[PDB]
């Protein structure tokens, strides 16, 4: 049923465009990642991976 909007409406009735981001961060091949520079890989030495 109709969901019309009027500018004269006060708070709590004005339209509220919403975008919700769903994440699935888990042990799986990662495709979306942040802007962190990749460094060279080192073996047989203690590092903060």
């Amino acid at each position: 049923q109709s969901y019309g909007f009027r500018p004269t409406y006060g708070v709590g009735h004005q339209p509220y465009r919403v975008v919700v981001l769903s994440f699935e961060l888990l042990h799986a091949p990662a495709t979306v990642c942040g802007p962190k520079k990749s460094t060279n890989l080192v073996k047989n030495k203690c590092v903060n991976f």
Binding site: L26, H27, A28, P29
Partner: peptide
């Protein structure tokens, strides 16, 4: 046509992407 059968033991996959060895892990 149509007929019935017994599934035996089958239809088991890897629920998760993590790796295990000599582990008796259980999952729901």
């Amino acid at each position: 046509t149509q007929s019935y059968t017994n599934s035996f033991t089958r239809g088991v996959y890897y629920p998760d992407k993590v790796f295990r060895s000599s582990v008796l892990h259980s999952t729901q």
